[PDB]
Each structure stands twice: as structure tokens, then as C-alpha cells.
Design a protein around this ligand. Structure first.
Ligand SMILES: *[C@@H]1O[C@H](CO)[C@@H](O[C@@H]2O[C@H](CO)[C@@H](O[C@@H]3O[C@H](CO)[C@@H](O)[C@H](O)[C@@H]3O)[C@H](O)[C@H]2NC(C)=O)[C@H](O)[C@H]1NC(C)=O
Ligand SMILES: *[C@@H]1O[C@H](CO)[C@@H](O[C@@H]2O[C@H](CO)[C@@H](O[C@@H]3O[C@H](CO)[C@@H](O)[C@H](O)[C@@H]3O)[C@H](O)[C@H]2NC(C)=O)[C@H](O)[C@H]1NC(C)=O
Ligand SMILES: *[C@@H]1O[C@H](CO)[C@@H](O[C@@H]2O[C@H](CO)[C@@H](O[C@@H]3O[C@H](CO)[C@@H](O)[C@H](O)[C@@H]3O)[C@H](O)[C@H]2NC(C)=O)[C@H](O)[C@H]1NC(C)=O
Ligand SMILES: *[C@@H]1O[C@H](CO)[C@@H](O[C@@H]2O[C@H](CO)[C@@H](O)[C@H](O)[C@H]2NC(C)=O)[C@H](O)[C@H]1NC(C)=O
Length: 170
RNA sequence: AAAAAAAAAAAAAAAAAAAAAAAAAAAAAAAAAAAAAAAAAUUUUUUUUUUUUUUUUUUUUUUUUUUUUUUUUUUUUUUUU
């Protein structure tokens, strides 16, 4: 679809919505703030698709109202930002992360400490850099089961990386 | 009482020529020093500009194989309008 962007009360009234797909829907969503998904405050969403939406920047607390959100898809986008952890603020019980197929995703020591209840995490084709800092960004995470960092040209990995990820299987 | 010649002692003052010394200043010659400086012969750091080797990401191009559709020119054959 070709909707420019959402409004304050676009999705207001959906008190039972749990499956939402917005793939290749928004063309004027270059920058994401915390006033986009405000309409879904009362929606117990479980799946969220946002691929091919030309997402390039998200603000702190954008998904704060998505407390019950478990599945999110931000792949196939043009994200150009520095991860700090506050981008995933408000995710009380999140299941997995879809941020593959990007061009720049810089990781920090606290980029993922806010949400430690993940299950899967793949960063395929994101060109991530500077993951040599200690402690590792994945240290707080405990229930990761699938971890993919392929097609990103990892410069270096140290001993502190992949520490304590006992639950990992793939 | 006083004045003078030969012979002998002389005490003081003003000058000088020498010897033995001693402080003071000024000249040099050697042993050191503290330095603000100067190079030269051995180690190496940081930064800028660039060379070579090696491992990989993105994009583009060539070829081969497989496969889905828009068009088809053929129809060996089958009942026919
Ligand atoms: C959505 O994103 C905007 C943009 O970052 C957030 O606005 C920012 O909010 C912080 C926190 O309040 C502000 O920092 C501090 O604000 C207080 C006033 O509350 C002020 O006294 C401090 O000096 C400091 O500035 C920040 O200025 C503000 N920035 C902008 C551009 O608005 C907003 O809070 C976010 N909302 C949610 C729900 O996440
Ligand atoms: C948002 O919607 C899109 C479109 O429906 C979903 O894309 C689909 O994603 C799945 C899983 O990534 C794809 O399945 C896999 O496809 C690859 C080829 O890309 C194949 O090699 C695998 O064996 C597997 O079949 C699926 O093809 C793909 N469909 C389309 C039309 O792109 C996307 O998953 C949705 N995001 C969600 C649900 O979070
Ligand atoms: C969204 O949240 C992140 C994480 O809280 C914010 O990043 C944080 O920004 C502050 C203010 O710049 C940083 O504090 C200072 O950082 C400098 C280094 O940039 C450091 O030298 C100072 O001593 C001080 O700590 C904080 O470190 C930084 N945190 C992280 C994890 O990056 C970001 O500003 C927020 N953005 C918005 C729009 O609200
Ligand atoms: C990490 O995974 C474990 C195992 O799935 C989680 O423990 C479960 O937590 C739920 C909800 O709190 C309980 O209903 C289950 O009974 C727990 N299972 C076990 C075997 O203990 C744990 O909560 C996860 N960690 C985080 C931070 O979410």
C-alpha cells in the first residue's frame, strides 16, 4: 500500500487486534517517533510486519505502548541509527527480533540489556561494526535460541563475546 | 758669663736607597664545577601521506544448469461444425 504515515488515532478502537501486517505500506515513514504506534496502546498485538517500509530512524520509546507485542519485523529496511537499548523500551514480553537486511546497525554494551527475554535474533546483511567492546552486548540476554550474524563481515570477536548464552542452539 | 777649632758620644725631626716578609687589587697558565646551548651515533614512539601481500562485504558483468509465465510457428493422432 501507499499510505504516507499513520496518525494519532488511525488504529484507535482495535481492542482485540493481535495480528497486524504493514509490509511495503508506508512511503513517508523515513523517521519513526514515539507518536506513530500510540493508537495501538490498547491493542494486544502479537505479530507486527513492517518490511519494505523504508524505515531509517526510530526514536526512543517508539514501541513503549507495545507491551504485549511478541513478533516484530523490521527487515528489508534502510535503518541508519545507533542502537542504545532504549529503542526497544516498553517490550515487556518480546519473543524474537527481525532486523536483518540493513546497511548500518552499530551495537553498544547496552543496546539489548533492556529486554533480556528474547528467543531468536538474526542480523543477516546489516553491516554491523564495533562489537569488540566489553562486556558483550549479548551478555544480559539469557533465552536466545537462534543467533545469526551472517553476511556482515565481522571484523573481530573476543573472548567476552557469546558469554553466558547457554540456551543458544542455532 | 760668652764665642769658637781638633777628638768623642749621641737623642729627636724631615728625607731617601736597599734586604726579609705580609695582607689587598689587577693579569695570565693549568685542575675542576653548575648550567641556558650545539651537533652525531645507536635505540625506538605518536601523527599525516602513500606502496605491496592476504581474508572477506556490497554493486556490476560473462557463461552453464534448473524452473515459472506473455507469445507462439508444428501437430503424428482423436471425436467434429
Ligand atoms: C518521544 O521522543 C521524544 C524525543 O526524544 C522525547 O522528548 C524528549 O523527552 C525527554 C524526557 O522528558 C526530554 O529530556 C528532558 O526533558 C525534561 C522535561 O521533561 C527537561 O526538564 C530536561 O531538561 C530534558 O530536556 C527531551 O528534552 C525531549 N526532547 C524532545 C525533542 O522533545 C519524548 O519524551 C518521547 N516520549 C516517550 C513517551 O518516549
Ligand atoms: C511479512 O510479510 C512478508 C510477505 O508475506 C513475509 O515474507 C515471507 O517471509 C518468509 C520467511 O522469511 C519467507 O519464507 C522463506 O522464504 C525464503 C526465500 O526468501 C525461502 O528460501 C525459505 O525456504 C522460506 O520459504 C517467505 O517466502 C516470504 N514471503 C514473501 C512473499 O516475501 C514476512 O515473513 C512477514 N514478516 C513477518 C511475518 O514477521
Ligand atoms: C535514547 O536513549 C539513549 C540511552 O539512554 C540515549 O543515549 C544516552 O545519551 C546521553 C546524553 O548524551 C549519554 O550521556 C552522556 O554520554 C556521553 C557520551 O556521548 C558521556 O561522555 C557522558 O559522560 C554522558 O554519559 C549516554 O551515555 C547515552 N547512553 C547510551 C547508552 O548511548 C539517547 O540520547 C536517547 N535519545 C533520545 C532522543 O532520547
Ligand atoms: C527464560 O526462559 C525460562 C524457561 O522458558 C523462563 O522461565 C519460565 O517463565 C515463565 C513465565 O515467567 C513460567 O511460566 C515458566 O514456568 C518458566 N519455566 C521454567 C522452566 O522455569 C524465564 O522466565 C525466561 N527468562 C525471562 C527473563 O523471561
Amino acid at each position: 500500500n501507499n499510505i504516507p504515515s499513520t496518525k494519532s488515532n488511525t488504529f484507535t478502537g482495535l481492542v482485540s487486534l493481535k495480528y497486524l501486517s504493514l509490509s511495503k505500506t508506508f512511503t513517508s515513514l523515513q523517521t519513526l517517533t514515539n507518536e506513530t504506534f500510540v493508537s495501538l496502546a490498547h491493542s494486544p498485538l502479537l505479530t507486527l510486519n513492517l518490511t519494505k517500509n523504508h524505515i531509517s530512524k526510530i526514536a526512543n520509546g517508539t514501541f513503549s505502548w507495545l507491551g504485549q507485542l511478541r513478533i516484530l519485523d523490521l527487515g528489508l529496511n534502510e535503518i541508519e541509527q545507533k542502537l542504545s537499548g532504549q529503542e526497544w523500551r516498553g517490550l515487556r514480553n518480546i519473543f524474537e527480533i527481525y532486523l536483518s537486511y540493513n546497511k548500518y546497525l552499530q551495537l553498544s554494551t547496552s543496546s539489548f540489556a533492556l529486554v533480556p527475554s528474547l528467543q531468536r535474533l538474526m542480523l543477516r546483511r546489516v553491516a554491523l561494526k564495533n562489537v569488540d567492546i566489553s562486556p558483550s552486548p549479548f551478555r544480559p540476554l539469557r533465552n536466545l535460541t537462534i543467533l545469526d550474524l551472517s553476511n556482515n563481515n565481522i571484523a573481530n570477536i573476543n573472548e567476552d563475546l557469546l558469554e553466558g548464552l547457554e540456551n543458544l542452539e542455532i
